[PDB]
Coordinates of C-alpha atoms and ligand atoms in Angstrom, one line a residue:
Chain A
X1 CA 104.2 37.4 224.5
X2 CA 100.6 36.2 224.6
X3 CA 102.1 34.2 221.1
X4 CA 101.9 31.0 222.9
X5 CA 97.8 31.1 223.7
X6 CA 97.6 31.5 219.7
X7 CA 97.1 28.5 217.5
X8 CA 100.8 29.4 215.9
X9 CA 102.9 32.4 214.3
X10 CA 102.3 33.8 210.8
X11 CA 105.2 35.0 209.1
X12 CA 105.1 39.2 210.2
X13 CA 104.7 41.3 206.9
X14 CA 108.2 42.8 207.4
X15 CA 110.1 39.9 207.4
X16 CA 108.5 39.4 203.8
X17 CA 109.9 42.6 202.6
X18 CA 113.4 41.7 202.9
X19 CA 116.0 40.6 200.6
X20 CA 117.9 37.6 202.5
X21 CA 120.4 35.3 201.6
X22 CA 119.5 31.8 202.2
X23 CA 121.3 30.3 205.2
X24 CA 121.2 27.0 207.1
X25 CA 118.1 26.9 209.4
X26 CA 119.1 26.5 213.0
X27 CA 116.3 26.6 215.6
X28 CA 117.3 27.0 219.2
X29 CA 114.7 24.4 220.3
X30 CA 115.4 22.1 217.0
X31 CA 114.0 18.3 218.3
X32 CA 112.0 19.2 221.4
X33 CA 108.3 18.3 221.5
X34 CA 105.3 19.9 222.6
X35 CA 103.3 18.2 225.8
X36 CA 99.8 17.2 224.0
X37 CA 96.6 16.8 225.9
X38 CA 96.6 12.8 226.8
X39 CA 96.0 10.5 223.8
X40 CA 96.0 13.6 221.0
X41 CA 98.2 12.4 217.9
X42 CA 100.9 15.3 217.1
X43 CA 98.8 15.7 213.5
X44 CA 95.3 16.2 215.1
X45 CA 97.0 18.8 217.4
X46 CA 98.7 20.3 214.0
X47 CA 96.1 20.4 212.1
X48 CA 93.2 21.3 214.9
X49 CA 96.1 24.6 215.2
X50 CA 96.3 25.1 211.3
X51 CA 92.2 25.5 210.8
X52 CA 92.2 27.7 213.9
X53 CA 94.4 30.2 212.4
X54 CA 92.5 29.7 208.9
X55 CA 89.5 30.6 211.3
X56 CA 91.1 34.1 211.5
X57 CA 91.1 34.7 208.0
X58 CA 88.7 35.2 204.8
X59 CA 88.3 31.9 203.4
X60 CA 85.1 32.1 201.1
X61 CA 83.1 29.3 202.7
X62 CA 79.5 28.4 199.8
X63 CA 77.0 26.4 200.3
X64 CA 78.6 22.6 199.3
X65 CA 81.7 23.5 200.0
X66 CA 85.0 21.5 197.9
X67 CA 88.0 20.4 199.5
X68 CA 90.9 18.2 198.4
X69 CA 93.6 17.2 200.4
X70 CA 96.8 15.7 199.6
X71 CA 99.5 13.9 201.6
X72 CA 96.5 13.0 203.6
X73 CA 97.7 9.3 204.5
X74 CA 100.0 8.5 207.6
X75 CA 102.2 5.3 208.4
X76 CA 99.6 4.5 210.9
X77 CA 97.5 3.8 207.6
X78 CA 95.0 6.6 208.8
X79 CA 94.0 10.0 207.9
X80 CA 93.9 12.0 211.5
X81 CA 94.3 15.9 209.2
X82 CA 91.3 14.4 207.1
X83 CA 89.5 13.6 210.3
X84 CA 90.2 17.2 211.7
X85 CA 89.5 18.7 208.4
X86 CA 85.8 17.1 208.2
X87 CA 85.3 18.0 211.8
X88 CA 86.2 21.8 210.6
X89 CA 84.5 22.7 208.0
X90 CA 80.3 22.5 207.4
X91 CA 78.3 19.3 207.7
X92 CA 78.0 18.0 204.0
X93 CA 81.4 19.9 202.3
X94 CA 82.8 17.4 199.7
X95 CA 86.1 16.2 201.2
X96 CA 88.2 14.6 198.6
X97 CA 91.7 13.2 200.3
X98 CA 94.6 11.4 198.2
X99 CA 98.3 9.8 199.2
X100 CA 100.8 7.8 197.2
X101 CA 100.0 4.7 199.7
X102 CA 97.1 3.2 201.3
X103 CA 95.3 4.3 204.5
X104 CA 91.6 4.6 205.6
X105 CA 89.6 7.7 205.8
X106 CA 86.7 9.5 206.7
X107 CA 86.8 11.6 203.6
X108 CA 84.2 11.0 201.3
X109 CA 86.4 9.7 198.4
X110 CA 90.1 8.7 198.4
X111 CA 92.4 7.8 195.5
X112 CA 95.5 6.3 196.2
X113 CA 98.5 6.9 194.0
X114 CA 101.5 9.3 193.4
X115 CA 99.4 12.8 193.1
X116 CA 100.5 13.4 189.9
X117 CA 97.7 11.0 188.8
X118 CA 95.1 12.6 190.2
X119 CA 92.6 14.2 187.8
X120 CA 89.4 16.4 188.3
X121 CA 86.7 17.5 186.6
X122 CA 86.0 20.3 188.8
X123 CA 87.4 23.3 190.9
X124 CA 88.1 23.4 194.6
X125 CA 87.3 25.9 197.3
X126 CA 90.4 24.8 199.4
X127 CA 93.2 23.0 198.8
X128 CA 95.5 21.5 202.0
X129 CA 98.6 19.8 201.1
X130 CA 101.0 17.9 203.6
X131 CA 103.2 16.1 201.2
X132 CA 106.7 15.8 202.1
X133 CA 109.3 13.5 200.2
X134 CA 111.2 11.3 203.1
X135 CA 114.0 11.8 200.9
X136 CA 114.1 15.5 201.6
X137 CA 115.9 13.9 204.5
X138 CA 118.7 12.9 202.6
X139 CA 120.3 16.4 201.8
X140 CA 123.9 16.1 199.9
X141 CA 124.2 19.9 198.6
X142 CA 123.2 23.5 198.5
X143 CA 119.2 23.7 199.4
X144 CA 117.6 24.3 195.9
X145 CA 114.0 24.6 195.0
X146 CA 112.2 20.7 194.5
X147 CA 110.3 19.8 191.9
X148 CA 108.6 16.3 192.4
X149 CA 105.2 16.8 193.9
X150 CA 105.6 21.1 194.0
X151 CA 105.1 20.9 190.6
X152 CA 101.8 19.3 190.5
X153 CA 100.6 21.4 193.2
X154 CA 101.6 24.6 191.2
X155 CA 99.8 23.8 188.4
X156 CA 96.9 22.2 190.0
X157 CA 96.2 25.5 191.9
X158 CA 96.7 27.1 188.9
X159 CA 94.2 24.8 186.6
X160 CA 91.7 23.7 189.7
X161 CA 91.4 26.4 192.2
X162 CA 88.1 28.6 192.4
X163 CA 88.9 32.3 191.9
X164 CA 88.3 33.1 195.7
X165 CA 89.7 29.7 196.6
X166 CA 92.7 29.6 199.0
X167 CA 94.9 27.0 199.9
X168 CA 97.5 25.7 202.6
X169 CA 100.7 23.9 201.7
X170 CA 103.1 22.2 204.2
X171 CA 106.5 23.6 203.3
X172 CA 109.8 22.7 205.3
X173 CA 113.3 24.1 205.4
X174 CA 114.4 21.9 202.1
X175 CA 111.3 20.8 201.3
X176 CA 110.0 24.1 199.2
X177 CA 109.3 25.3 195.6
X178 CA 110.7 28.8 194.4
X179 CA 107.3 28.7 192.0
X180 CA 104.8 27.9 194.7
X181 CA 106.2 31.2 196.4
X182 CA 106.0 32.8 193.3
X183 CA 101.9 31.7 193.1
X184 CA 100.9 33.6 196.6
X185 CA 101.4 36.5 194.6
X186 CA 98.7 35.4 192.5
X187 CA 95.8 35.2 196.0
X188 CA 94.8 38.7 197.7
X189 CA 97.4 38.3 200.5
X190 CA 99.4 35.5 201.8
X191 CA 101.5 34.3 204.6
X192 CA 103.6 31.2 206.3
X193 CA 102.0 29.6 208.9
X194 CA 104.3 28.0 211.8
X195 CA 101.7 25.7 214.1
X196 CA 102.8 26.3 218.0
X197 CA 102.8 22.7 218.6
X198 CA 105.5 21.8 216.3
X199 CA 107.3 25.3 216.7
X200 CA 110.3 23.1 216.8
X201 CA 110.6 22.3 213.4
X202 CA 111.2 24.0 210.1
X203 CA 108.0 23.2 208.5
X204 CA 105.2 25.7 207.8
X205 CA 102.2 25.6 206.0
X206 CA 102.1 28.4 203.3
X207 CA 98.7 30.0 202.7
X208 CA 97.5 31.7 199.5
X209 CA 93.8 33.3 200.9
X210 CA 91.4 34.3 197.8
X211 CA 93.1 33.3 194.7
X212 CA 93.5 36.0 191.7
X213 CA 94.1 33.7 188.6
X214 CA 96.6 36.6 188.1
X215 CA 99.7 38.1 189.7
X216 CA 98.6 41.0 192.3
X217 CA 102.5 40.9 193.6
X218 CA 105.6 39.7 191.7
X219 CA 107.4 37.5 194.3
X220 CA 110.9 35.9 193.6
X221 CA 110.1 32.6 195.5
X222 CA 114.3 31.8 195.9
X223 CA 114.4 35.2 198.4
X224 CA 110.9 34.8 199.7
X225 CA 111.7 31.2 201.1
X226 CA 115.3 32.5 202.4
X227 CA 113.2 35.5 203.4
X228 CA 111.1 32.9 205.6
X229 CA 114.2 31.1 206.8
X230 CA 115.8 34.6 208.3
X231 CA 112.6 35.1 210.1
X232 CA 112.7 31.4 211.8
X233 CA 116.3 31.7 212.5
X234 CA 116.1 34.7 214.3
X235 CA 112.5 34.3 215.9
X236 CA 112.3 31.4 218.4
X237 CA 109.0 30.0 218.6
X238 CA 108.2 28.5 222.6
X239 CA 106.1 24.9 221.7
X240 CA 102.6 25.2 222.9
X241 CA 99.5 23.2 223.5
X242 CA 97.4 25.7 224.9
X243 CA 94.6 26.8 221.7
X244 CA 94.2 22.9 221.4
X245 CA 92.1 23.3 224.8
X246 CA 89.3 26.0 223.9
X247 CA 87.5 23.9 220.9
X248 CA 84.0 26.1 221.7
X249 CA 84.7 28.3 218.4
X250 CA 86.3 25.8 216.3
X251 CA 83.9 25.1 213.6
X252 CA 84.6 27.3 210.3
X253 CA 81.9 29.7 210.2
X254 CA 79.1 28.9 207.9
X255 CA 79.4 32.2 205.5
X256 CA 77.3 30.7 202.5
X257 CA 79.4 32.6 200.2
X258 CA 78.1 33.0 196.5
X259 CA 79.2 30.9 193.9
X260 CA 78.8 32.3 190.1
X261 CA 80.3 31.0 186.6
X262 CA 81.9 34.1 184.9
X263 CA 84.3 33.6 181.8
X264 CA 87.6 35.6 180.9
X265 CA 85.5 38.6 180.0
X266 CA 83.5 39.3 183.2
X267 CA 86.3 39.5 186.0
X268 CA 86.3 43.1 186.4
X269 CA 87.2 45.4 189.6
X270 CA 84.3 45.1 191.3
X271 CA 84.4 41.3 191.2
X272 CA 88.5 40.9 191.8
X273 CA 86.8 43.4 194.8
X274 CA 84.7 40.8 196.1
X275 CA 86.9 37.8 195.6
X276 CA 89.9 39.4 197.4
X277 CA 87.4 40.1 200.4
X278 CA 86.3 36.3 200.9
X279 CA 83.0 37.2 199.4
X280 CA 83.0 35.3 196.2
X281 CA 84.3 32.1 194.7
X282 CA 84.1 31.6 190.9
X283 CA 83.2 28.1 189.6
X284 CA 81.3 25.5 187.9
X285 CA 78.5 24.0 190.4
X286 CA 78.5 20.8 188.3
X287 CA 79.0 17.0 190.2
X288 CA 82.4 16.5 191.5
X289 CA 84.4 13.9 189.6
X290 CA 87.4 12.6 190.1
X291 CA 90.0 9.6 189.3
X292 CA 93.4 8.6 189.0
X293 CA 95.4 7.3 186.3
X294 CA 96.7 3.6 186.3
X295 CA 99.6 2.8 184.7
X296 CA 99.3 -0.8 183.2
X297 CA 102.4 -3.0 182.9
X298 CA 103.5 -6.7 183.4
Chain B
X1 CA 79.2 -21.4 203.1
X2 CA 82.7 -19.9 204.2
X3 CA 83.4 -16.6 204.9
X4 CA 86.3 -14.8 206.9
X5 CA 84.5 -13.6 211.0
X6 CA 86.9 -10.7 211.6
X7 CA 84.4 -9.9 214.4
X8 CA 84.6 -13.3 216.5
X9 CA 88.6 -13.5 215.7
X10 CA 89.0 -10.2 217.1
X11 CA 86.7 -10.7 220.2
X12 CA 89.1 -14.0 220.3
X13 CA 92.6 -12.2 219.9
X14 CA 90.9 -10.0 223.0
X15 CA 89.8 -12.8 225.2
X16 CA 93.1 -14.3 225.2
X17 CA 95.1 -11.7 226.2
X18 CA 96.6 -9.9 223.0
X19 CA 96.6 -5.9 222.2
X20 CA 94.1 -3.7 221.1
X21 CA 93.8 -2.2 217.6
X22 CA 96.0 1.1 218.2
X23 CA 95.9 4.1 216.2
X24 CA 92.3 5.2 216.4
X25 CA 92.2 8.7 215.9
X26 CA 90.8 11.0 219.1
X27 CA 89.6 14.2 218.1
X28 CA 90.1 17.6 220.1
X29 CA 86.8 18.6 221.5
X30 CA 84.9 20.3 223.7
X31 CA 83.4 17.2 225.8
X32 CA 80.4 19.2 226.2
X33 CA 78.3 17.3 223.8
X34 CA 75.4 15.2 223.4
X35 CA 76.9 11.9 224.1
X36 CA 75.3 10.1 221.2
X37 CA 76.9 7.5 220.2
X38 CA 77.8 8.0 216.4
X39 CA 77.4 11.5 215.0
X40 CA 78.1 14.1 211.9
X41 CA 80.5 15.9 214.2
X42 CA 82.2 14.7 217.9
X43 CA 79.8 15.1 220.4
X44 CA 81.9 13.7 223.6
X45 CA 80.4 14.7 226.5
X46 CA 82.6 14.9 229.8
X47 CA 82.5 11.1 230.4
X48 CA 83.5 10.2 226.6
X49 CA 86.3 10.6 224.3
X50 CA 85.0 11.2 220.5
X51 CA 87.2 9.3 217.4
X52 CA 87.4 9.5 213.8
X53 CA 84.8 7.3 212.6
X54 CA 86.9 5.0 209.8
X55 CA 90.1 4.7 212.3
X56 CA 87.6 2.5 214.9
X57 CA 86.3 0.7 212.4
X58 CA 87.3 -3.3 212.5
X59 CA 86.6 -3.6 208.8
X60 CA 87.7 -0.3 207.7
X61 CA 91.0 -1.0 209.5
X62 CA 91.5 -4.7 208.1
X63 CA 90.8 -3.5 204.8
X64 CA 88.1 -6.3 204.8
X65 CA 84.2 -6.3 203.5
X66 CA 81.8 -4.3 205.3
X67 CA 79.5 -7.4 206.7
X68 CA 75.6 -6.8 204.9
X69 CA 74.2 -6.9 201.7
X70 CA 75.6 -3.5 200.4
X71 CA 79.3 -3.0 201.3
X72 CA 77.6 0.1 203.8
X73 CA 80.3 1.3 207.0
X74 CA 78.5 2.7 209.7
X75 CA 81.4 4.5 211.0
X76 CA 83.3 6.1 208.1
X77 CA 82.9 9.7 207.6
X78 CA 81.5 9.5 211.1
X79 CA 82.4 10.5 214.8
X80 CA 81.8 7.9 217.7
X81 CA 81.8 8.7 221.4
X82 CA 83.6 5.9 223.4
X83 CA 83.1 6.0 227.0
X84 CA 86.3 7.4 228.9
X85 CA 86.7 4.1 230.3
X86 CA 86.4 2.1 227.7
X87 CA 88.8 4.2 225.1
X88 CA 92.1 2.0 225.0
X89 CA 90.0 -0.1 223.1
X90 CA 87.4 1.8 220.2
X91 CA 87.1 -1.1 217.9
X92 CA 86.4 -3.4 220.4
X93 CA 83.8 -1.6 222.0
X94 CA 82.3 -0.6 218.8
X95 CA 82.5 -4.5 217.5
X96 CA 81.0 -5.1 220.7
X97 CA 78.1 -2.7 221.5
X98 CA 74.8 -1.2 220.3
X99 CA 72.9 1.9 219.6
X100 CA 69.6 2.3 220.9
X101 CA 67.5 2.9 217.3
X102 CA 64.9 5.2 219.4
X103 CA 67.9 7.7 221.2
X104 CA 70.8 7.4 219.5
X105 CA 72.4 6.5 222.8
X106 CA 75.0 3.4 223.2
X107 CA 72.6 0.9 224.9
X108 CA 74.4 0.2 228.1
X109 CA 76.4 3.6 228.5
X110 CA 74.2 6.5 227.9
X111 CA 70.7 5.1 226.4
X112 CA 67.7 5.0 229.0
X113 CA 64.9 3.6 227.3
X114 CA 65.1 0.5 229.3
Ligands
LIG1 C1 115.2 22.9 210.4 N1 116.4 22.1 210.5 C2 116.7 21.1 209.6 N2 117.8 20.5 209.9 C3 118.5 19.4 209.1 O1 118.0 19.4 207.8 C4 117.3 18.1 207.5 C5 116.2 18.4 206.5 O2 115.4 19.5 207.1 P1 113.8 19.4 206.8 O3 113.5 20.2 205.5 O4 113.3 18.0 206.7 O5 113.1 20.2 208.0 P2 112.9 19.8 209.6 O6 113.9 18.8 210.1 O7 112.6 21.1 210.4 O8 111.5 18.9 209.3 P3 110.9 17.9 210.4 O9 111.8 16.7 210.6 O10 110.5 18.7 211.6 O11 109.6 17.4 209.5 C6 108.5 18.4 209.4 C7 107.3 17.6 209.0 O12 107.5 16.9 207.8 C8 106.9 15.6 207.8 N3 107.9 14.5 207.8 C9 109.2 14.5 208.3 N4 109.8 13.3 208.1 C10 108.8 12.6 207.4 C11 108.9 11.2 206.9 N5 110.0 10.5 207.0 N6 107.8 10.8 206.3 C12 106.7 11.6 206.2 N7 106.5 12.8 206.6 C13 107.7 13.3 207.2 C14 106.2 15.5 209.1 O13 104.9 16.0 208.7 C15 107.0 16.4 210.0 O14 106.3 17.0 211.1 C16 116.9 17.6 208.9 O15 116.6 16.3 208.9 C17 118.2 18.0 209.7 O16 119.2 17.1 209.4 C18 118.3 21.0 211.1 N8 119.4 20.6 211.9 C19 119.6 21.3 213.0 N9 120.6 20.9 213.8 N10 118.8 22.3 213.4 C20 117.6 22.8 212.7 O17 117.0 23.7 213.1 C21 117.4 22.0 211.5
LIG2 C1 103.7 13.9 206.8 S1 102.9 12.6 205.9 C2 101.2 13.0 206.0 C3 100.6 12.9 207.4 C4 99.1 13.1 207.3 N1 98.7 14.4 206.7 C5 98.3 13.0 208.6 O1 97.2 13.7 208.7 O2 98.8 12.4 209.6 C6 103.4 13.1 204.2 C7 102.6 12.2 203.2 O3 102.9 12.7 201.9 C8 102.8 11.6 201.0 N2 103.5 11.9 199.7 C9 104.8 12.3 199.5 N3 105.1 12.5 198.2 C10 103.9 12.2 197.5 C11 103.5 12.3 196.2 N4 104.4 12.5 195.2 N5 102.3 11.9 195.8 C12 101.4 11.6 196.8 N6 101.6 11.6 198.1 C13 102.9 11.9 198.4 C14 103.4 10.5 201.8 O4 103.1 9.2 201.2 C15 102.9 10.7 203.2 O5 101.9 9.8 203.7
LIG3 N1 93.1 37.7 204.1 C1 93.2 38.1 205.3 N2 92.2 37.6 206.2 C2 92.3 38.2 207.4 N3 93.2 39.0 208.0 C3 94.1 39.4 207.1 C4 94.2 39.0 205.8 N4 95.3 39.6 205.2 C5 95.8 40.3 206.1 N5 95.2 40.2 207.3 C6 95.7 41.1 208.4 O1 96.5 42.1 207.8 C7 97.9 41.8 208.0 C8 98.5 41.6 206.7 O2 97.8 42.7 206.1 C9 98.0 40.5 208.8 O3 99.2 40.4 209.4 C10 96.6 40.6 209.5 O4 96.8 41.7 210.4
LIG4 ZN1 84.2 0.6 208.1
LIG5 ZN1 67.4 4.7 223.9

């Protein structure tokens, strides 16, 4: 009802209960487009909507906060999500951004290449992800799960992300990973995140808030995305503008969240307590480094 | 002695009548800022239009040197307030204009020192 003053529509818990079949995603206002404020870029709007809703939630927020962001690049050869991400969170967070080719941004390192070159020596406090494979677009037979860049992402969540962490990964109706679905079992809850201005589409952004480094829920990713596919088919989403006009409480709040090393050994109750309440990330505070590997041929 | 003058060929490529450098990226905000001219976070106020610092940029956008001793961009990782008037064209007007040192104002469209 009041849905369209919201930034967008999370996935309702029910719907992630079920036990659907996957079908053929068909959304009664498939290829209509949202009116933006004059001049706004469809991805600032997207992801101004996307770190509204992760306003609403408990993202552990420390002093020198670290983000990375993939798929940050456009064909424009700019970075508009990087722009809104670095507008979002606190003055002086680490904003790392990456894409498989060039652009310019105002994050304060970049690394161009295929992501499954990018290494770092430290963990992350958020991870955004809008990669999406053009060739997605090119669907011959039955929608399975993709590997390609899901694969990366699984395991670099699962090698790089702070206990506490969360993260937010664009999914689509065939762009999707069984195991990726599988891994939101592993944060304290979870959802799919459709923005209002691009209710049209099939893409979502699925968010794992305060990661576990362990299974809390086992989740069969092949139902879970057909779960999520049910719940778009049968849940039209009006397009909408409107959050992108009330910017007054946009900033993500400055929680100063403590940051502590604790081995294997020391994650007890009490702490799995405090990370699943956004009040605790678990990390390494050493320098943030960072490269990607060239391969050399002639 | 040579080097490339992005800055005069672009003032050039203006004079004569050709399009402005597109895809600068305008930020959602509140326009209820402090109007200064280049800043850690938009800061529009209701006669400006705040843009991603790198994406109005000549030299980020030509993937070209930075022109000074030390490769430095003034712009990247930044936010810059164009006035409302002046906003189908960023780069230009940021090629083109300067901020008052004692304010922080664009000298000419906000800064009163003068
Ligand atoms: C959801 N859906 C999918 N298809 C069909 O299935 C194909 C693949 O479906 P998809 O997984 O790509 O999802 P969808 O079409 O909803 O994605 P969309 O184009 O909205 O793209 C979502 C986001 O992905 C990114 N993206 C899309 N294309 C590119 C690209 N070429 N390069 C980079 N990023 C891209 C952008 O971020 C974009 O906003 C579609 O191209 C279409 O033939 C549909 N057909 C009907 N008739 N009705 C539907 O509801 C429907
Ligand atoms: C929808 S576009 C990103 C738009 C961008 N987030 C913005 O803010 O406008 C998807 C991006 O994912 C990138 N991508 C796809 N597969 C990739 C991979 N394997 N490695 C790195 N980047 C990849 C593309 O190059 C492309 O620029
Ligand atoms: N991590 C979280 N941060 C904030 N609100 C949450 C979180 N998890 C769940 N919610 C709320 O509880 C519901 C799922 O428990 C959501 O639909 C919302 O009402
Ligand atoms: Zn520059
Ligand atoms: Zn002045």
């Amino acid at each position: 009802s009041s849905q369209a003053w919201q930034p967008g529509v999370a996935m309702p818990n029910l719907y992630k209960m079920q036990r659907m079949l996957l079908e053929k995603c068909d959304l009664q206002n498939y290829g209509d487009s949202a009116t933006l404020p004059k001049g706004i870029m469809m991805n600032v709007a997207k992801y101004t909507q996307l770190c509204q809703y992760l306003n609403t939630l408990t993202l552990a927020v420390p002093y020198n906060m670290r983000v990375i962001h993939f798929g940050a690049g456009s064909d424009k050869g700019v970075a508009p999500g990087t722009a809104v991400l670095r507008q979002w969170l606190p003055t002086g967070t680490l904003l790392v951004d990456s894409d498989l080719n060039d652009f310019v941004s105002d994050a304060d390192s970049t690394l161009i290449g295929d992501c499954a070159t990018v290494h770092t020596a430290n963990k992350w406090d958020l991870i955004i992800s809008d990669m999406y494979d053009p060739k997605t677009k090119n669907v011959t037979k039955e929608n399975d799960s993709k590997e390609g860049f899901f694969t990366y992402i699984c395991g670099f969540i699962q090698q790089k992300l702070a206990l506490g962490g969360s993260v937010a990964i664009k999914i689509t109706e065939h762009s999707w990973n069984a195991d990726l679905y599988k891994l939101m079992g592993h944060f304290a809850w979870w959802t799919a995140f459709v923005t209002n201005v691009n209710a049209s589409s099939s893409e979502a952004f699925l968010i794992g808030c305060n990661y576990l480094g362990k299974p809390r829920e086992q989740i069969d990713g092949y139902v879970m995305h057909a779960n999520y596919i049910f719940w778009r088919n049968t849940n039209p989403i009006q397009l909408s503008s409107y959050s992108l006009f009330d910017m007054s409480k946009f900033p993500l709040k400055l929680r100063g969240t403590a940051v502590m090393s604790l081995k294997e050994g020391q994650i007890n109750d009490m702490i799995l307590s405090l990370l699943s309440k956004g009040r605790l990330i678990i990390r390494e505070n050493n320098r943030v480094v960072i490269s990607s590997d060239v391969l050399v041929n002639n | 002695a040579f080097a490339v003058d992005a800055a005069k060929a672009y003032k050039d490529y203006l004079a004569s009548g050709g399009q402005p450098i597109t895809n600068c990226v305008k930020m959602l905000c509140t326009h209820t800022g402090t109007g200064q001219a280049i800043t850690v976070t938009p800061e529009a106020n209701m006669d400006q239009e705040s843009f991603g610092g790198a994406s109005c940029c000549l030299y980020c956008r030509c993937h070209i040197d930075h022109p000074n001793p030390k490769g430095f961009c003034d712009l990247k990782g930044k936010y810059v307030q164009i006035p409302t008037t002046c906003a189908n064209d960023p780069v230009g007007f940021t090629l083109k204009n300067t901020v008052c040192t004692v304010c922080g104002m664009w000298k000419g469209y906000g800064c009163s020192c003068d």
